[PDB]
Write an enzyme that holds these catalytic residues in place. Structure first.
Site, PDB file in Angstrom:
ATOM      1  N   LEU A  38       0.829  -1.190   0.000  1.00 42.65           N
ATOM      2  CA  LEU A  38       0.000   0.000   0.000  1.00 42.65           C
ATOM      3  C   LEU A  38       0.869   1.247   0.000  1.00 42.65           C
ATOM      4  O   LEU A  38       2.015   1.230   0.460  1.00 42.65           O
ATOM      5  CB  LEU A  38      -0.930   0.020   1.212  1.00 42.65           C
ATOM      6  CG  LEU A  38      -1.931  -1.129   1.262  1.00 42.65           C
ATOM      7  CD1 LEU A  38      -2.742  -1.056   2.531  1.00 42.65           C
ATOM      8  CD2 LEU A  38      -2.831  -1.107   0.045  1.00 42.65           C
ATOM      9  N   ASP A  39       0.305   2.332  -0.523  1.00 40.11           N
ATOM     10  CA  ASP A  39       0.904   3.649  -0.407  1.00 40.11           C
ATOM     11  C   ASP A  39       0.812   4.117   1.049  1.00 40.11           C
ATOM     12  O   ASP A  39       0.099   3.533   1.871  1.00 40.11           O
ATOM     13  CB  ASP A  39       0.196   4.619  -1.359  1.00 40.11           C
ATOM     14  CG  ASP A  39       0.941   5.936  -1.544  1.00 40.11           C
ATOM     15  OD1 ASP A  39       1.957   5.954  -2.269  1.00 40.11           O
ATOM     16  OD2 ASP A  39       0.511   6.951  -0.953  1.00 40.11           O
ATOM     17  N   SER A  40       1.569   5.167   1.378  1.00 41.94           N
ATOM     18  CA  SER A  40       1.434   5.781   2.693  1.00 41.94           C
ATOM     19  C   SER A  40       0.047   6.372   2.881  1.00 41.94           C
ATOM     20  O   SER A  40      -0.567   6.196   3.937  1.00 41.94           O
ATOM     21  CB  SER A  40       2.491   6.856   2.893  1.00 41.94           C
ATOM     22  OG  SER A  40       3.790   6.314   2.824  1.00 41.94           O
ATOM     23  N   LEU A  41      -0.484   7.030   1.846  1.00 39.04           N
ATOM     24  CA  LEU A  41      -1.810   7.627   1.928  1.00 39.04           C
ATOM     25  C   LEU A  41      -2.912   6.580   2.014  1.00 39.04           C
ATOM     26  O   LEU A  41      -3.986   6.873   2.552  1.00 39.04           O
ATOM     27  CB  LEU A  41      -2.043   8.538   0.728  1.00 39.04           C
ATOM     28  CG  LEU A  41      -1.066   9.706   0.613  1.00 39.04           C
ATOM     29  CD1 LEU A  41      -1.325  10.501  -0.649  1.00 39.04           C
ATOM     30  CD2 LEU A  41      -1.133  10.592   1.836  1.00 39.04           C
ATOM     31  N   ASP A  42      -2.659   5.368   1.512  1.00 43.87           N
ATOM     32  CA  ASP A  42      -3.567   4.255   1.763  1.00 43.87           C
ATOM     33  C   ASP A  42      -3.637   3.939   3.249  1.00 43.87           C
ATOM     34  O   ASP A  42      -4.723   3.746   3.802  1.00 43.87           O
ATOM     35  CB  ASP A  42      -3.117   3.024   0.982  1.00 43.87           C
ATOM     36  CG  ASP A  42      -3.263   3.197  -0.507  1.00 43.87           C
ATOM     37  OD1 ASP A  42      -4.150   3.962  -0.930  1.00 43.87           O
ATOM     38  OD2 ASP A  42      -2.494   2.563  -1.257  1.00 43.87           O
TER      39      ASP A  42
END
Ligand code: PC1
Ligand code: PC1
Ligand code: 3PE
Ligand code: ZMP
Ligand code: SF4
Lengths: 82, 114, 98, 156, 110, 42
Positions: A38-42
């Site tokens: 996952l992305d950090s913003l996820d």
């Protein structure tokens, strides 16, 4: 907030409402960045979903260290009694 | 090489400000779709938020990302306060613009641009 | 007795049962209370005119004035409730159950 | 026929009443507002033509765009034009409302108000004089005089 | 009876002109309009001061209702009592006005 | 005597004061030209 098992069940229910996490690979010790990919913003919208479900403001200096559902349920268990 | 900071001493505080700004936009998007009575969904506006954050994700300078957080907070302040109209919110979604040719071949067909 | 008195009494009872069966608004209760007052005005007026009882002709005006003053007081109470909960709903007035 | 005569006389009646009672909503954007105010001043006096001074936008007949339309005010112009009841008309006064004018190559200026609203009369000048604006309003009245609404309705 | 005829004629002319004003431009087929306020969507803020001037109207109007039989009351044979009570009602309206004044009730709509 | 019905009744405050649980914002828009955002208190 009552029992730790219901808190873990509700964390897993939040993360299986989350549509980018495959519910097959999702465990309680699954890492968001390197296992589920996952992305950090996820992870940020994961933590905001935790704030929507559990009803308290998670700050930023301790949400960056929530990298698995076990860390999330341990953090919520720290912020309450159980 | 020794420069004066803006808010962030390094990239950690800077990423913290980026992260708080993404939180604030994610919280704001359903109110924006409601009160502007947009014809989009909350998923679509949050995908546009994520697109605008991941467009600038290649930046490694703390002052540049400080100014990006400053300008993002100015955009959010102009959206929460109803200072934008519906037109200014929907300028992020290039709806009336025809899709540009992306490959070599159709750019060769339509004109001289590289 | 007279047939118009039937209708004025029945109007008073209709406004009574409206005042005795709330829906949500305190303003609708105040309107039912003032419908009761209006029907009392009409009935007293028709009797006093019908009997040629001269000195009671100032009676309905008094019956108006006091009760309209009463109505003003009621409106102020509604406003204070409306300054507490935002609405005039009678189900917000339930703190005194305990 | 007889119906052709009746719709001719009725078009003449309604066009007389619409052109002889035009009510303007003036956008006082820029310098052309001053010359609109001179077209309302006692030398020219639009009100002697039935053209009242500052009708409210929900009851106006023509929208006089008098001044520069910037990009920051283009949706406000469009919103006021959308709120006007029909038959609404738009007079473009002066060069910036007509084609951008002295600010045509600017980053912030709508190049003519015809990009935003449909325009019926283009009054040229920088600013056009109050006599020239009054000329444009009389040409708008002649445009309303030759409208054929009921005649085209009778032929459709 | 003539009054009922006149009220019915006035109401009928008013309803006729309202029906004409609401249905004469409906015959035109202009266009269907989509059209997607200083306050944006905020709830109507209550002001205590408008309610105070409305209640002050109601109370002085009840005092006016007491004052209305004076041209007939001057015809009495108890003129000393009539004059005393007339001046007393106008004085109580004045005292209500003075109390509304001096306790800042007539402020910002003075 | 608390029953199942009176199982949610909390006691009243000691000073009998319950907590009360804004001001107008007007956007005088462009409708020269000027936009104003008023924060009014009546
Ligand atoms: C007592 C005080 C004054 C009273 C009012 C003034 C008296 C006159 C009232 C009638 C005026 C004329 C008819 C209404 C206006 C017509 C204008 C118009 O838009 O026409 C096009 C309209 C619509 O025609 P259309 O099909 O072209 O529609 C235009 C809009 N599009 C094309 C986009 C759909 O025509 C009509 O509505 C015709 C209806 C009958 C006309 C009158 C019949 C005789 C009446 C006597
Ligand atoms: C404060 C009150 C000031 C006014 C008092 C009455 C003044 C007056 O004219 O009274 C004579 C009037 C009338 O007296 P009169 O002499 O006209 O009576 C003749 C009888 N009639 C009217 C039937 C023809 O009132 C009375 O005498 C009795 C009523 C008032 C009594 C005093 C009330 C005091 C209240 C204190 C609280
Ligand atoms: C017995 C005495 C009365 C006899 C007449 C009864 C008339 C019909 C009313 C019967 C009750 C209908 C009803 O739904 O009553 C409840 C309603 C208020 O309830 P509400 O908040 O609207 O809805 C939630 C439901 N409890 O209550 C009401 O709205 C009642 C309003 C009553 C107004 C009376 C009108 C005249 C009736 C005939 C003459 C008496
Ligand atoms: C309706 C439409 C709404 C439009 C909203 C417009 C707002 C735009 C605001 C833009 C502000 C930014 O882009 S600040 C981002 C700049 N950050 C950087 O350059 C540092 C790199 N950042 C990242 O990689 C970010 O993804 C994170 C989350 C900070 C870290 O992720 P990585 O770790 O995995
Ligand atoms: S057309 Fe010229 S003179 Fe007229 S308002 Fe524009 S800038 Fe001013």
């Amino acid at each position: 907030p009552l029992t730790l098992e219901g808190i873990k069940d509700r964390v897993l229910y939040v993360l299986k409402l989350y549509d980018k996490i495959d519910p097959e690979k999702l465990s309680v010790n699954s890492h968001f960045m390197k296992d589920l990919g996952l992305d950090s913003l996820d992870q940020v919208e994961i933590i905001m979903a935790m704030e929507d479900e559990f009803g308290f403001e998670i700050p930023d200096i301790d949400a960056e260290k929530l990298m698995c559902p076990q860390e999330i349920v341990d953090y919520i268990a720290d912020k309450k009694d159980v | 090489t020794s420069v004066k900071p803006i808010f962030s001493r390094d990239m950690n505080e800077a990423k913290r400000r980026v992260r708080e700004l993404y939180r604030a936009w994610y919280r704001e998007v359903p109110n924006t779709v409601h009160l502007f009575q947009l014809d989009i969904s909350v998923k679509q506006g949050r995908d546009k938020v994520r697109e605008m954050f991941k467009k600038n994700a290649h930046v490694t300078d703390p002052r540049v990302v400080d100014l990006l957080v400053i300008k993002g907070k100015m955009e959010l302040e102009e959206t929460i306060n109803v200072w934008k109209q519906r037109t200014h919110v929907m300028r992020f979604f290039h709806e009336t613009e025809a899709p540009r040719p992306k490959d070599f071949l159709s750019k060769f067909y339509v004109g001289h641009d590289p | 007795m007279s047939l118009v008195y039937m209708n004025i009494m029945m109007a008073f009872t209709v406004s009574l049962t409206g005042l005795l069966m709330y829906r949500s608004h305190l303003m609708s209760s105040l309107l039912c209370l003032e419908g009761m007052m209006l029907s009392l005005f009409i009935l007293a007026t028709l009797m006093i005119l019908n009997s040629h009882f001269t000195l009671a002709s100032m009676m309905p005006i008094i019956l108006l004035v006091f009760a309209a003053c009463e109505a003003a007081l009621g409106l102020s109470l509604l406003v204070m409730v409306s300054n507490t909960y935002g609405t005039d709903y009678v189900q917000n007035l339930n703190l005194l159950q305990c | 026929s007889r119906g052709e005569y009746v719709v001719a006389k009725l078009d003449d009646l309604i066009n007389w009443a619409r052109r002889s009672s035009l009510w303007p909503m003036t956008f006082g954007l820029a310098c052309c507002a001053v010359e609109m105010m001179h077209m309302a001043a006692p030398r020219y006096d639009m009100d002697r033509f039935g053209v009242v001074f500052r009708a409210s936008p929900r009851q106006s007949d023509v929208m006089i765009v008098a001044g520069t339309l910037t990009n920051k005010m283009a949706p406000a112009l469009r919103k006021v034009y959308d709120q006007m009841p029909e038959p609404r008309y738009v007079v473009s006064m002066g060069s910036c409302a007509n084609g951008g004018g002295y600010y045509h190559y600017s980053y912030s200026v709508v190049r003519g108000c015809d990009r935003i609203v449909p325009v019926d009369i283009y009054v040229p000048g920088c600013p056009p004089t109050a006599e020239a604006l009054l000329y444009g309003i009389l040409q708008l009245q002649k445009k309303i005089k030759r409208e054929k609404r009921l005649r085209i309705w009778y032929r459709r | 009876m003539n009054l009922m005829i006149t009220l019915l004629t006035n109401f009928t002319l008013a309803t006729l002109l309202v029906t004409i004003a609401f249905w004469l431009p409906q015959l035109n087929v202009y266009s269907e309009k989509t059209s997607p306020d200083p306050m944006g969507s905020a709830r109507l803020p209550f002001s205590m001061k408008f309610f105070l001037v409305a209640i002050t109207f109601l109370l002085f109007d009840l005092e006016i209702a007491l004052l209305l039989p004076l041209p007939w009351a001057s015809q009495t044979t108890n003129l000393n009592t009539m004059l005393t009570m007339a001046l007393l009602l106008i004085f109580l309206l004045a005292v209500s006005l003075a109390y509304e004044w001096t306790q800042k009730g007539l402020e910002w709509t003075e | 005597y608390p029953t199942k019905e009176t199982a949610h009744w909390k006691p009243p405050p000691w000073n009998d004061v319950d907590p009360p649980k804004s001001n107008l914002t007007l956007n005088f828009g462009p409708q020269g030209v000027l936009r104003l955002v008023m924060e009014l208190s009546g």
